Amino acid sequence: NTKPSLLPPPVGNPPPVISYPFQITLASLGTEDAADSVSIASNSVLATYTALYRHAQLKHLKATIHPTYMAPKYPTSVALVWVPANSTATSTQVLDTYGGLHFCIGGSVNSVKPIDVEANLTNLNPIIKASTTFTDTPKLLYYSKAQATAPTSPTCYLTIQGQIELSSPLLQASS
Amino acid sequence: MEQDKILAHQASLNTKPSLLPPPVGNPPPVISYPFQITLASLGTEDAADSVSIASNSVLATYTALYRHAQLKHLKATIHPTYMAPKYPTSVALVWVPANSTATSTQVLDTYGGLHFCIGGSVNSVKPIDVEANLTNLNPIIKASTTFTDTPKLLYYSKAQATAPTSPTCYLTIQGQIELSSPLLQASS
Amino acid sequence: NTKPSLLPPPVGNPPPVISYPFQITLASLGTEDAADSVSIASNSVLATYTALYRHAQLKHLKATIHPTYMAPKYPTSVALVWVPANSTATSTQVLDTYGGLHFCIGGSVNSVKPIDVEANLTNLNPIIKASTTFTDTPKLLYYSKAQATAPTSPTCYLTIQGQIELSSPLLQASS
Amino acid sequence: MEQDKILAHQASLNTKPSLLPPPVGNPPPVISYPFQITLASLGTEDAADSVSIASNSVLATYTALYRHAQLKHLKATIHPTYMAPKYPTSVALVWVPANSTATSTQVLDTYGGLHFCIGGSVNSVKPIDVEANLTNLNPIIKASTTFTDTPKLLYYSKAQATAPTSPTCYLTIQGQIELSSPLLQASS
RNA sequence: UUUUUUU
RNA sequence: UUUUUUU
RNA sequence: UUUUUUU
RNA sequence: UUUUUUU
Prior knowledge:
Chains A, C: It comes from Desmodium yellow mottle virus. This is part of a larger assembly, with four copies of chain A. The first copy, chain A, has one helix at residues 44-50, and strands spanning 17-29, 34-39, 53-67, 76-84, 101-105, 115-118, 127-129, 138-145, 156-169. Chain A has a single domain, classed as Jelly Rolls. Chain A is elongated, with a radius of gyration of 19 Å. Chain A is mainly beta. The structure holds four RNA strands.
């Protein structure tokens, strides 16, 4: 036979698309070691925006590290990398992953400027909501090592920001 | 005029998403099969349900032999019976994608939800058709890929307090389904 | 002087617009007399959709009366009219207002078909959210009289349905 | 093939919404006035506030004499002082329309929110400018009509536990405002 | 419906 | 820098 | 950065 | 009606 599945042809005008922006704080770092993996498509916050639609696609997406007033005196290490969600790499293997970055935040000259790390949406699947579920959407891995004698306030914040294109309203009730 | 941001670049490579390659090997033969299924006998007691077309037991007896199944046409129909004139019955229904969170008791709170009064002497006992829009809802109820937006019908019905013993109307769905790609099953 | 206020010229591309549909049940009628006035722009449900944007305009809007299984035996009167929100007319003066309609639902032949009453958006201000507040947005007035010996279940439902065009995201927090 | 709906028509008439008619009577003379206002002295204790430009007491002393006031340019600036090198201070800020529900403690959870580390030996004590985008935010802070989307600045600052007695930096806003249409006030 | 708005 | 003056 | 994807 | 056959 050989008839898996594609879509029927778009009937008329394609549905209108709107972009909604967002910025989310994933973590406050520097007071203790930290390591997590964040699957963007499963994020609680983004889900509230996509709940009303059938199609949601990331337009731009990036992670930013913002050093705070405690970074100068308490150098902190932050490593991170973007991988498709089906990758099995863990937060402790960032430097063993192609493209993995490790930064030294604070202590030395010029080391308090914020850092941007864009996610390459041509290397990661940007569709986080559609007629079917995808397995290769963006996942961010991050690892952080803090000073043994740590501060009581974070040395930096890790956020992600971007824009999602939303389209095709998903019928829901008003109640 | 320096900027206050450092840009770090994560090395890229040539890696892309993918689905199913093209047919170019002889597009499979497609057959169209008709059906009419009675979903419910209403009017003897209140009733409410949600019917996911892709999960329906009866329709599945036809699609079980194939790997691909796509609706060509689909509609719900309410057929008043000999008990409708004396026992007016309420029937409300709406068609939504299967991933909608709407429930059978919220038909009138959903865009497009309809509520009808079936029976009543003064009324009409003409049957009513409500077509499913297959350009909004995804018509592919069976494929290599699982889709989440296939047709789901929500319905609610309220019966007279002092109800009849035979139904006042029947709710059925009817259409034609395009089938292709035999799926090996046993014959025992 | 004589310099009240207009807007500065649209700089570049106009912002994208999306339409979101809705249907809301305003009332279950026929079990007792009822009378209310509904200011659309102040509606709780619609507010949840417009909360994320700066501009919201009604595209289509109508009221529908849906007779139920109790209408045949319990004729009910329903009167309604659409007026700008700054009108001081009350629900009991529908027939004393230009365009006011009064319907008899149930009891007689052909009287169980649902009824649509579209709101004229060229006679009412469709902008329910913008840079300033408007005073002439849609307001629906409705009145209903029930049988003295009323049923325990409603004889009809009053709903409103339409679509709102939303645009220009309003910056909000993710928290 | 009859439909199951009755359409009722509400009689219409010629009635439309309206605002302000055109100027054509001699467009009023507009003057541009410059300003620089210190909003806060930071670094001696934690601080957080929300400043609605249209409600600011100081800026209002200039706009009180006119009926129309529109920002031509506007920016916030952080100026490190002689105490910044030894007492690093955190300052976060973002510009939002006045009708935004975001609060000063949610700067980093708002699209565009910035957080800076001021001071620190290794650091730089160069002043920082953050321009307000007057094409996103409504620049008309005073008019015949009241607008809800004028510029609002949100800021948060965290100081060292063992803080200095003099501020580590000053936060100010600066720009030019176009004024027109004298508004009669008393001179006493 | 108590239909004369959308030039 | 708290850069929109020098047409 | 541990930069060779966007033809 | 539970209307998509008669090219």
